[PDB]
Scaffold this active site. Structure first.
Site, PDB file in Angstrom:
ATOM      1  N   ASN A 144      34.699  32.835  27.978  1.00  0.00           N
ATOM      2  CA  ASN A 144      33.837  33.887  28.561  1.00  0.00           C
ATOM      3  C   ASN A 144      34.652  35.013  29.157  1.00  0.00           C
ATOM      4  O   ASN A 144      34.269  36.186  29.094  1.00  0.00           O
ATOM      5  CB  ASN A 144      32.913  33.342  29.646  1.00  0.00           C
ATOM      6  CG  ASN A 144      31.920  32.368  29.101  1.00  0.00           C
ATOM      7  OD1 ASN A 144      31.434  32.551  27.986  1.00  0.00           O
ATOM      8  ND2 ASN A 144      31.612  31.331  29.860  1.00  0.00           N
ATOM      9  N   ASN A 190      19.940  21.340  27.545  1.00  0.00           N
ATOM     10  CA  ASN A 190      21.220  21.466  26.875  1.00  0.00           C
ATOM     11  C   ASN A 190      21.620  20.132  26.238  1.00  0.00           C
ATOM     12  O   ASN A 190      22.280  19.311  26.877  1.00  0.00           O
ATOM     13  CB  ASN A 190      22.266  21.942  27.893  1.00  0.00           C
ATOM     14  CG  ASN A 190      23.671  21.994  27.307  1.00  0.00           C
ATOM     15  OD1 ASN A 190      23.866  22.020  26.084  1.00  0.00           O
ATOM     16  ND2 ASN A 190      24.664  22.026  28.192  1.00  0.00           N
ATOM     17  N   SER A 222      25.390  31.173  25.209  1.00  0.00           N
ATOM     18  CA  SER A 222      26.368  31.911  24.427  1.00  0.00           C
ATOM     19  C   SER A 222      25.912  32.474  23.073  1.00  0.00           C
ATOM     20  O   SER A 222      26.693  33.151  22.414  1.00  0.00           O
ATOM     21  CB  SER A 222      27.618  31.052  24.179  1.00  0.00           C
ATOM     22  OG  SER A 222      28.265  30.764  25.422  1.00  0.00           O
ATOM     23  N   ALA A 243      24.532  27.560  25.239  1.00  0.00           N
ATOM     24  CA  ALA A 243      23.981  26.656  26.244  1.00  0.00           C
ATOM     25  C   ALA A 243      24.039  27.300  27.587  1.00  0.00           C
ATOM     26  O   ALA A 243      24.990  28.012  27.878  1.00  0.00           O
ATOM     27  CB  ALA A 243      24.790  25.343  26.292  1.00  0.00           C
TER      28      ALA A 243
HETATM   29  B1  LIG Z   1      28.277  29.400  25.948  1.00  0.00           B
HETATM   30  O1  LIG Z   1      26.898  28.799  25.880  1.00  0.00           O
HETATM   31  O2  LIG Z   1      29.097  28.527  25.052  1.00  0.00           O
HETATM   32  C1  LIG Z   1      28.700  29.313  27.476  1.00  0.00           C
HETATM   33  C2  LIG Z   1      27.870  29.554  28.568  1.00  0.00           C
HETATM   34  N1  LIG Z   1      28.542  29.325  29.701  1.00  0.00           N
HETATM   35  C3  LIG Z   1      28.079  29.408  30.969  1.00  0.00           C
HETATM   36  C4  LIG Z   1      26.728  29.158  31.226  1.00  0.00           C
HETATM   37  C5  LIG Z   1      26.242  29.217  32.528  1.00  0.00           C
HETATM   38  C6  LIG Z   1      27.084  29.496  33.578  1.00  0.00           C
HETATM   39  C7  LIG Z   1      28.425  29.698  33.330  1.00  0.00           C
HETATM   40 CL1  LIG Z   1      29.497  30.042  34.664  1.00  0.00          CL
HETATM   41  C8  LIG Z   1      28.938  29.648  32.037  1.00  0.00           C
HETATM   42  N2  LIG Z   1      29.797  28.956  29.366  1.00  0.00           N
HETATM   43  C9  LIG Z   1      29.919  28.910  28.033  1.00  0.00           C
END
Ligand SMILES: *[B]([O])([O])C1=[C]N(C2=[C][C]=[C]C(Cl)=[C]2)N=[C]1
Ligand SMILES: OB(O)c1cnn(-c2cccc(Cl)c2)c1
Length: 358
Positions: A149, A340, A61, A315
């Site tokens: 997301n 992570n 993210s 992450a």
């Molecule tokens: B962010 O890092 O807060 C975030 C990333 N994801 C994510 C990562 C991999 C796959 C999917 Cl479906 C989502 N969600 C939040």
């Protein structure tokens, strides 16, 4: 590489790698505007490939900061307005709950409860239309923040519609290229695969899988060099020669909503500097970061404040990233790891480093 920087980076990061069992890590500190780089460990444990300044990591993210700046650039281009209804760019979104939901709400997670994830079952574009048409808000627009997301991901896809460019083309031509981020990718080309670290989740080598709105919400990969250059660009937007991009960066750091002591930007999140470290450290934990919280509108938004801690965590299944910087001090940090590990440990290490240098 001044000894002060060497010492505080190593003193903080070495124990962090040990406690968290991080396979590989790269760190950049931007000090008085110049970057200094540090690497440890393995990009690929099986093949014994070390992390180098050219290793690509999944930013997860932290990609939201690129989406937010690219949206900002589209506003500066006069292509979109954050005050525009979502339905202006997606006329097929006819369901009545969308009345009153603007690009601002999408960009800032304030549409009224759009979910953290787009459901895995959403594979096609008609699947995506169906999902948003059927989604029922829990809250009125602009009343509550829920990190999502499905919210900023849709903003990024709509923000580039007037350009006619695909999201990836818009990002490449309007953000990566002008900033000379020549080793930053939404899709890693075969020529660069040699450099693409594996992520590690429960000991297994993993890479992020395709998913809806992936590019827009969490899909960028980058090196520690390009990410330092991203921080430099966000520290000092006025050195950027492309006018709309300079303006887009400033728009992404404006303050649109406040919850507790944090302000929501476009992708970026900001707090007043000096910050209380417990506030950003505890605040980064997903028990708080992902929670539904009431927001106060900042009417009109406050323009980018130089005395801020501006940051974003990121992450994926196998990677953990963090970026933070303080414009008024010309100071920042990028921490990229292929595990992570918990957000508060990232922020604790970043504050220990930036505080010692500030
Ligand atoms: B962010 O890092 O807060 C975030 C990333 N994801 C994510 C990562 C991999 C796959 C999917 Cl479906 C989502 N969600 C939040
Ligand atoms: O005068 B204010 O402080 C002001 C003016 N424009 N904005 C603003 C901030 C962020 C995004 C957009 Cl579209 C406008 C604030």
């Amino acid at each position: 590489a001044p000894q002060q920087i060497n010492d505080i980076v190593h003193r903080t990061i070495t124990p962090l790698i040990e406690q968290q069992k991080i396979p590989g890590m790269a760190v950049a500190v931007i000090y008085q505007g110049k970057p200094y780089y540090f690497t440890w460990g393995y990009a690929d444990i099986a093949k014994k490939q070390p992390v180098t300044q050219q290793t690509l990591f999944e930013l997860g993210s932290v990609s939201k900061t690129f989406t937010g700046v690219l949206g900002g650039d589209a506003i500066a281009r006069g292509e979109i307005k954050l005050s525009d209804p979502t339905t202006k760019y997606w006329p097929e979104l006819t369901a009545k709950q969308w009345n009153g939901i603007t690009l601002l709400h999408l960009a800032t997670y304030t549409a009224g409860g759009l979910p953290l994830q787009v459901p895995d079952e959403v594979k096609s574009s008609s699947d995506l239309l169906r999902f948003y048409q059927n989604w029922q808000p829990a809250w009125a627009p602009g009343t509550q923040r829920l990190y999502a997301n499905s919210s900023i991901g849709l903003f990024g896809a709509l923000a580039v519609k007037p350009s006619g460019l695909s999201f990836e083309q818009a990002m490449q031509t309007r953000v990566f290229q002008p900033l000379k981020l020549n080793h930053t990718w939404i899709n890693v080309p075969p020529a660069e695969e040699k450099n693409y670290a594996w992520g590690y989740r429960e000991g297994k080598a993993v890479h992020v899988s395709p998913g809806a709105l992936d590019a827009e919400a969490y899909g960028v990969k980058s090196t520690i060099e390009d990410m330092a250059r991203w921080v430099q660009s966000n520290l000092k937007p006025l050195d950027i020669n492309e006018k709309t991009l300079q303006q887009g960066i400033q728009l992404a750091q404006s303050r649109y909503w406040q919850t507790g002591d944090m302000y929501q930007g476009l992708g970026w999140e900001m707090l007043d500097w000096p910050v209380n470290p417990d506030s950003i450290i505890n605040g980064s934990d997903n028990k708080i970061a992902l929670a539904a919280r009431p927001v106060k509108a900042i009417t009109p938004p406050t323009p980018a404040v130089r005395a801020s801690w501006v940051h974003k965590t990121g992450a994926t299944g196998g990677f953990g990233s963090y970026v933070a910087f303080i414009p008024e001090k010309e100071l920042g940090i990028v921490m990229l790891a292929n595990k992570n590990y918990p957000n508060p440990a990232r922020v604790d290490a970043a504050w220990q480093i930036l505080n010692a240098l500030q």
